[PDB]
Paper text:
Most eukaryotes have two Rad51/RecA recombinases: Rad51, which is expressed constitutively, and Dmc1, which is only expressed in meiosis. Here, we present cryo-EM structures of S. cerevisiae Rad51 and Dmc1 nucleoprotein filaments in their ADP-bound states.
To solve the cryo-EM structures of S. cerevisiae Rad51 and Dmc1 in the ADP-bound states, we mixed the purified proteins with 96-nucleotide ssDNA oligonucleotide in the presence of 2 mM ADP. Interestingly, in contrast to our observations with Rad51, the Dmc1 filaments were interdigitated, similar to what was recently observed for human RAD51 filaments in the presence of ADP. Therefore, the interdigitated filaments were computationally deconvolved into single helical filaments, yielding well-defined structures with an overall resolution of 2.7 Å. Previous studies have shown, mutation of H352 within S. cerevisiae Rad51 to alanine, tyrosine, phenylalanine, lysine, or methionine, severely compromises both ATP hydrolysis activity and nucleoprotein filament assembly at physiological pH. Consistent with this model, we find that Rad51 H352 and Dmc1 H289 move away from the neighboring protomers when the nucleoprotein filaments are in the ADP-bound states, corresponding to a shift of 4.8 Å in the case of Rad51 and 5.3 Å for Dmc1 measured from the epsilon carbon if the histidine side chains. Comparison of the ATP-bound and ADP-bound states reveals that S. cerevisiae Rad51 D374 and Dmc1 D311 move away from the neighboring protomer in the ADP-bound states, corresponding to a distance (measured from the alpha carbon) of 2.7 Å in the case of Rad51 and 3.7 Å for Dmc1. For Dmc1, residues F244, R248, and E251 interact with V224 and R187 from the adjacent protomer in the ATP-bound state. Lastly, similar to Rad51, Dmc1 residue R52 from one protomer contacts residue E231 in the L1 DNA-binding loop of the adjacent protomer. As with Rad51, all of these contacts are disrupted in the ADP-bound state of Dmc1.
Author numbering:
A (entry chain C): 16 to 263, 281 to 334
B (entry chain D): 16 to 263, 290 to 334
C (entry chain E): 16 to 226, 232 to 263, 286 to 334
D (entry chain F), E (entry chain B): 16 to 235, 237 to 264, 285 to 334
F (entry chain A): 16 to 226, 231 to 263, 286 to 334
The structure:
C-alpha cells in the first residue's frame, strides 16, 4: 500500500496532504478512486489543487490500459484467508479472499461469530497454511467479542496468544452511526499496511435497531449502500478481505448486489453444521461440513 | 460508571444536563451509545446542541479502535455472580456473567425463583466469594418475592440479614408496560454504580396475559423485543448482570427440569463463552446448592 | 386499601370515577395494575385521559424500587389464617397465606368443605391466635355450604354465632358464567377492604358440567382474575378441587382418607415451605389435630 | 317456586316463554342455571333473546353475595322428610332432606320398596311431625309399586287413603330411555310446586338390563347425565330425591347422602348411615310393620 | 485502417500530426468523421491548417457516391464473432458483428461477465469458425475481470492461454471520469488496427455511484457523450463494442443491437434478442460451462 | 432533362462551362432557377458572362402566369414510387411523389430504415407498378444501410438483385459538413437524369451532435433548400427520416409509430393536397408490406 505522504517530492505541500487526511484521503489508491468533483468539496481544497494532485498521483501507480498478464500478476497478491475448515477452504477456492467482499449468513445459533473469531485467529498465520500474516479489524455490532476465546484459539494454533490478541483490533459499534464513523476512520489504520482483514459481526444489527418502521428502510438501504460501498472500496484499496455477518436471506437486492461471495449456514446433527455456498464469481454452489470446537471452526474429523 | 455530571465541566449547561436526565440519559456511556437522531428526539433538545454534547461525551473517554489486549483488561473487571452451586458455577465459569442477559426456563417448582433469591443474596458477597459486593434490584412480575428467604440465605452464608436485606431495591412489575418503564428508569439507580445485578421474574408473565389472541402477537413480539433490547444495553454500560426468568436476544439460556425426589436437573442451551453441559442441583437451606451441600 | 375516591382530589372529574368503577377498577392498586390498552377499552376513556389518570394514581401511591426493608415491613401485614389444626398450620408456616392462591384437593369427602367452613370461621378471629379479624367471601358451586356448621364451630371457638354468620358473604354459583361474573363483581364488595378470605368450593364443578379448549381458556381467565384480586386486596383465595390449575395456585395441599375419621394432609407444593405431611381429623370443633 | 310465566310481565312475549318451556325450562331458577350457550340451542331463540331473558330473570330473583344469615334463612326452607322410624330420623338430623339426593341401598328384602312406600305416604303429612305436606313422584323400574300397600300405611297413619293415592304421581319406566324421558319431562309437573319428593325405585334395575357387556359400561356417561338432571331438579324445585339401588364411583359422588340396609336377627333390620354431608356415621334398628318402617321397640 | 501518419508525405509537418495525436485524431477516417469546428478547438490549430489537413485526408480515401455492389463488398469486411453458443449465433445471424454496439443486459448472476470472458477468448479465434483473430479491449467497472477464467476457457478452446491473455488489454475504471478518460485514450491503442472487440463491463457501474440525487441525472448527457464516443470508435475501427448492463431510454438508442438475459430452471439460462438491426426476436438456451457460454445440449 | 451542353449551340464557348459546373450548375433548369447574383459569386464568371449565360439559356423556356392548359401534361410526368404497401400508397396517392420532399419521422425501431431499403427496390420497377425505372441515391448518416437487405427485397419482388445494387449509389455522410457537400455535388450525378430517388437517413442525426442553435438551423435550412431544389428540377423524390422548421421544407410528412403488439402505424401527418388518413404496415421479407399482405 502507498499512502499520500510520499507525495512530498512530487510537489505537494504539507497543507494539501493534511487537507486530504482530514477529508478521508489516506492513500494514493483513494486519491485515484475519488473523483475531482468529490475532491473539490474537501474542506480547504480549491478547484485547481485537486487536478494537480491527480496528475501528481497518476505518476506513481500506472493507471491505464495493461495486458491481462500483469493483471494476473496483480491478482496474485490477494490472500486466501483460511476459514478454519479445510473443506470450507477448498469449496471457496482457498477461503475468504482479500480485495473482495464475502458474506456469511444464516439463522441464529449457526456458528457465525465463531467463524469471525476463527478468522481473527488464523489471519495472523503466515503464508502456506491459509493465513495472511496481516492484522484484523473487528467491529462488534453485537457486543459479543470474547477476547479470551481468541487467546484460546491462539493456544490451539500454537502461537504466542498475547501477540495474537495485540494484533487483532476491536471496536464496539454502539450504534449504526458509530459503525459508519469507524469504517470511515479505517483510513489511518489500514494505511500502515499491517491490517489485512475487516470482520463485521454483525453488519445489519445496528441498522435494524436504529432504523425501525417501513418509513426509513430506503434510507437505511442507501446508507447501507454507502457503508457497503466504503467497505468494498476499502477492500480494493488496502487489499483486505471484508467478512460480513448477517442474520435471516435478508438485506435485499442491495446486500445481494453488494456481496460478491455469499455463504449460508444451517444446523446439522449435534455440533455438526452444514454450509452452502450460494453465490460466488468463481465457483458453483456446493456443500460443506464443519464443526465448532476448542479451536474454533474446523472439520468434523478434527 | 461515569455519570452525566462530567458533561457540565466539559461545556454543557445545567439545563441541558437536566433535559438529558428527562431524556433517560444518566451516564457518559449512555449518551455515547445514543444515536444523534435518537438523541434529538427528546423534547426540548435541538439538533444543534446534541452534536456538541456528543463530542463533550467523547473527549472524556475514547470510542473506536482499542487493542484487544486493552479490551481484555476491561473484560477482567466483570464479576461472576455465583448461583451458590459450585458445580453450576463451574459449568458457567463462576456463575452468571455481567454485561450480558441470562434467561432461565422450565416447568414450575424448578428453583428459578430460588435461583433469583440466591443471586439476590450472594451479590452482596465480596469478590473471590462469588459476589460483586454490590447492590441488587429485583423486578417482580409474579409476586413471589420473600424477604424472609433473603434473611434466611444471609444466615446461611453468615451475612447480616439486615445488611443484605437493605442492599436490595425492590419493585413489582405489575404489568408489561409498567415493566417497560421500570426497566427504563433504572438509569438513576445504576448511576450510583454500586449495582451488580438486576433480576426480572418472570419476563413473559406480564406480556403473555397483556396481549392475548392471535390478532396482535406479532406486534406484542416487537414490544417484548424492544424491551429485551433495552435490557441488553442496560446490561452493558452499567456492568450489571440481568437475570431473566421464563415460563414454558438472551445471551445465556438455561433449562431446569424436575428430577427424582427433591433434586432437579440443569441444562445449558446458549452461551457465547462455553459449550453446553449438564448438572444437578437441590434447594437446601442456603438456596440452590449441590446435592451433597 | 384505598378507594379511587382519593384520586378525585387530583383534578379528576367524577365521571372518571364512575367509569373506572363500572369497568371493574375500584382501588388505586387496581389502577396501577391495569394497563393503558385495557383501560382505553373502557367506554368513555381516551388515550391521553388514561395516561393522565394513571399518572395521578401513581402520584397517589408510588411504584418503584424501594429498599427491601420497606418490602419486609409491608410484608409483615400479610395475614396467616389458621386452618384449625396446629400441625398443618405449622407445616404451612402459620396457616394459609394471603396475597396467594391456596388450593386443596383430594378424593370425594376428604374434608374440603368442612375445612372450608373452619377457614370461614377462623379468619374472623383476631391476630395473636391465627385469625384475620375480618369477613370472608364464600363461593359455593356444589351446594355444600351449611351456615349451621359455621354456627356450631363458632360456638366451639366461644364467640357470638349470629355475628359470625352475619360476618360471611356467601354466593352460590349456578353455572360457569355465573361463577365468572361473581368473581368479577367481587371487586366492588372488596373495595371496602374488610374481607380476608375468598373460598371457592369447588373451582371446576361447573366447568366440567358446562363443557375443552374454550373451557380451559375460560378457567385460566377465571384463575388469573382470582389471583390478581388476591394480590390486590390483601386476601387469601382458598380453592377446593376434586379428582393446569397448579399454575395459578401458589400453594397446593392434597387430602387423603386415613383410617376411620383420621385424614392426612400432604404439602404437595409450596413457594416457601418444604414438602411436609400432617395428620388431622374432622370433629365437633371442625378441623383439629389427631390427638385433639 | 316461580315459573317462567313470571317473566311475561317483565317484557317477554308468550312466544319466547313457550319456546323456553319446549326446551324443558319451566322455572326462573332453571333459566339462571342454564348457561347462555345451552339456551342458544333452544329452537327459535336468538342470542339477544337469550341475553334479555337472562337479564329479566336476574331481576325477579336476585343472585349475588349475601350475608350468611340470609343463607341460613334460605336453608330454613329445606324440608326434613320422616323416614318412619324415629331413631333413624334422629340419626339423619330430621329424616330425608330436600335440595339433595338421598340414596338407600342393600340386599333384597331389606325393605327399600317398603321404605319408598313409607316416604310416599309420610311426605303428605304436614310439617312439625316429619312430613313435607307435598306431592311425591314415584318412578317404578321394577313393577313393585303397590297402591294397596300405600293405602294400608295411610290407614296406619290415621289419614285418608284415597287422597294419599291421588296425591302421588306414579310412572312406570319400561327401559332406560323411557326412564330418562320421564325424568326430563318431570319439569312440567314439578313446576306446580306441589311435589316435595321424587322416588326412583330403583335407579339401576333398567340400566343393568338395557346395557350389557364391557362396551356399554362406559356409555352407562348417560347415567351421569341422568343423575345430574335429578340433582338439578332437586336443587331447583326444593324436592328430595330418594333413589333406590341394589348391591352385588358414579352414585358415590352423585348422591349427597347414602344408607346401607342390612338384615338383623329374625325380622329385625339395621340401617347404617354410610355417608352424609353433615352427620357422622351411626347405626339404627328398625322393623317393617303394617305402617311401613317403624321403630323396633314399638 | 490507415493512421494519420499517412499525411506526413502529403504536405503536413510532424508538429501538426503530433497535435492531431494529442487531439485524439489518429486515423484518416477519424479526420473525415470529425467537423472542422472540432479541429479548430485543438490548441495550436488554425482554420486554414484544419482545412488543408481535411483536403489532404480526402485524397487518401474517397468519400462519395459509389454503387451498392462496392458497399456490399465493404460490408463483407464485418466480423461475425461467435457468442459461444451456436444457437445464439444463428439467432444473431453470425454472432457479434463489428461496426455496431451490442448491449447485453440482465440481472445479477445472469452471466454477462462470463459471456464477456467467452468473447475475450472467442474473438481471438481465427475466422471461418466464428472468430475475429484480433485483440480485445476490456474495461472493467466492478472488479469482476478474472484472467484465470479466460485462461480456463481458452484451454477449453484449445488455445495457448498465455498469448490469449497477452492479447486482451485490461483497464480497471475506478470512477466515471477515469472510465471516460480511458475510452477517449482508446483511440491511440486502437490505431494499430489489431483489435476487434471492446468490452465494457459494466457500462453504468461507475455512473450509479459517481452521480447521486435527482439533481445529477441531467448531467448523467456526459454518459451520452461517452456512448457516442464508443459508437464512433466501433464505426471507424471495425471493432464490436460489447456493453454490459445491470437491470433492477437513450441508452437503448445508443446500442445498435440488444440481448436480454434471464435465469431459467436450475442452471439453464435464456437469451432473448430483444432488439436487432436486421434480425427478428427469438429465444436461445445457453449455459455457463467450463468453456464459458455454450449450448445446453453440450 | 437537358444539360448545359445543349446550350453550346446558343453561342456559348466551352471555356466557361467547366467553372459554372464547378459552381453547381449542370442543366438549363439550374441556370433558370439560379439568380444573377449567385452566378456572380461563382469565381471566374464575370457579370457580363452571368447575364450572357442566362439570356442565352432563357430562349428555350418561358416565365409568366401559367393557365393549367399544358401543365397537366407536364404534371403527369411525375412518378409514383410505391412504398410497398398498397394501403400506404393509397393514402399517399399511389406512393412517394417526385418533385417534392417526403419526410417520415418516428422513434427508435419504427421501420424508417426498412422503408428506405424497400423504396430503394420499388423504384427499380417500371411504371404501372409503383416504380420509376431508375437509379437511387442513398445518403446514410447512421450507418444502418445494408446491401444484403436490398438483395432480400429485390428477391422478394422477383428482380435481379445484383442489378438492383448496381442501380443504387451509396454515400455515407460522416458529419453535417460532409452531408451538405454530398447534397451540393449530388447535382453532378443527377445530371445524368436517370435517378428517381434520394434517401437521407437520417436528416437530423449529424446536426444533433455537431451543434449554438442559431447557426444549426441556419445551416439546416440551407441544406433543406438545396434538397428541395434538387427534387424540384431533377424530377426525383427526396426521402428523409427523423428520430423523435423541418415541417415547412418537407411537402409530405408521415409519422411511424409502434402500436399494440407487432402492429405499426403509418399516419399521414401532413400532405400538400391529400387529407390525413390511417394505415397499418408490417416489415416482412419483401420489405414494407400490408398487414394482410
Ligand atoms: N470457549 C468455547 N469453547 C468451545 N466452544 C465454544 C466456546 N464458546 C462458544 N462455543 C460454541 O460456539 C457455538 C457457536 O457460537 P457463535 O458463533 O457465537 O454462534 P452465532 O452463530 O449465534 O454467533 C456455540 O454453540 C458454543 O457452544
Ligand atoms: N469461474 C467460473 N467458472 C464457471 N462458471 C462460472 C464462473 N464464475 C461464474 N460462473 C457462472 O456464471 C454465473 C454468474 O455469471 P456472471 O457473468 O458473473 O453474471 P453477471 O455478469 O450477469 O452478474 C454463476 O452463477 C455461475 O453459474
Ligand atoms: N429482414 C427483416 N425482415 C423482417 N423484419 C425486419 C428485418 N430486418 C429488420 N426488421 C424489423 O424492422 C425493425 C427495425 O426498424 P428500423 O428500420 O431499424 O427503423 P429505424 O431505422 O426507425 O430504427 C426491427 O424491429 C425488426 O423487427
Ligand atoms: Mg453471533
Ligand atoms: Mg457482472
Ligand atoms: Mg434507422
Amino acid at each position: 500500500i502507498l499512502s499520500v505522504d510520499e507525495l512530498q517530492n512530487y510537489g505537494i505541500n504539507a497543507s494539501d496532504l493534511q487537507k486530504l487526511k482530514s477529508g478521508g484521503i489516506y492513500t494514493v489508491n483513494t486519491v485515484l478512486s475519488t473523483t475531482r468533483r468529490h475532491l473539490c468539496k474537501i474542506k480547504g481544497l480549491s478547484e485547481v489543487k485537486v487536478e494537480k494532485i491527480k496528475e501528481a498521483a497518476g505518476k506513481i501507480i500506472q493507471v491505464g490500459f495493461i495486458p491481462a498478464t500483469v493483471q494476473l500478476d496483480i491478482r496474485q497478491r490477494v490472500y486466501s484467508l483460511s476459514t478454519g475448515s479445510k473443506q470450507l477452504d477448498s469449496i471457496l477456492g482457498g477461503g475468504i479472499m482479500t480485495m473482495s467482499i464475502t458474506e456469511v449468513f444464516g439463522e441464529f445459533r449457526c456458528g457465525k461469530t465463531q467463524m469471525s473469531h476463527t478468522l481473527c485467529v488464523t489471519t495472523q498465520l503466515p503464508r502456506e497454511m491459509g493465513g495472511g500474516e496481516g492484522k484484523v479489524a473487528y467491529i462488534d455490532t453485537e457486543g459479543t467479542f470474547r477476547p479470551e476465546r481468541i487467546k484460546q484459539i491462539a493456544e490451539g494454533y500454537e502461537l504466542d496468544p498475547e501477540s495474537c490478541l495485540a494484533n487483532v483490533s476491536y471496536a464496539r459499534a454502539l450504534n449504526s452511526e458509530h459503525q459508519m464513523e469507524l469504517v470511515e476512520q479505517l483510513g489511518e489504520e489500514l494505511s500502515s499496511g499491517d491490517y489485512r482483514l475487516i470482520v463485521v459481526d454483525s453488519i445489519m444489527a445496528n441498522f435494524r435497531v436504529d432504523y425501525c418502521g417501513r418509513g426509513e428502510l430506503s434510507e437505511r438501504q442507501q446508507k447501507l449502500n454507502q457503508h457497503l460501498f466504503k467497505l468494498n472500496r476499502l477492500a480494493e484499496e488496502f487489499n483486505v478481505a471484508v467478512f460480513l455477518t448477517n442474520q435471516v436471506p435478508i438485506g435485499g437486492h442491495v446486500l445481494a448486489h453488494a456481496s460478491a461471495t455469499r455463504i449460508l449456514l444451517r444446523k446439522g446433527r449435534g455440533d455438526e453444521r452444514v454450509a452452502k455456498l450460494q453465490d460466488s464469481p468463481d465457483m458453483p454452489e456446493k456443500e460443506c461440513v464443519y464443526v465448532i470446537g476448542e479451536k474454533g471452526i474446523t472439520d468434523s474429523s478434527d
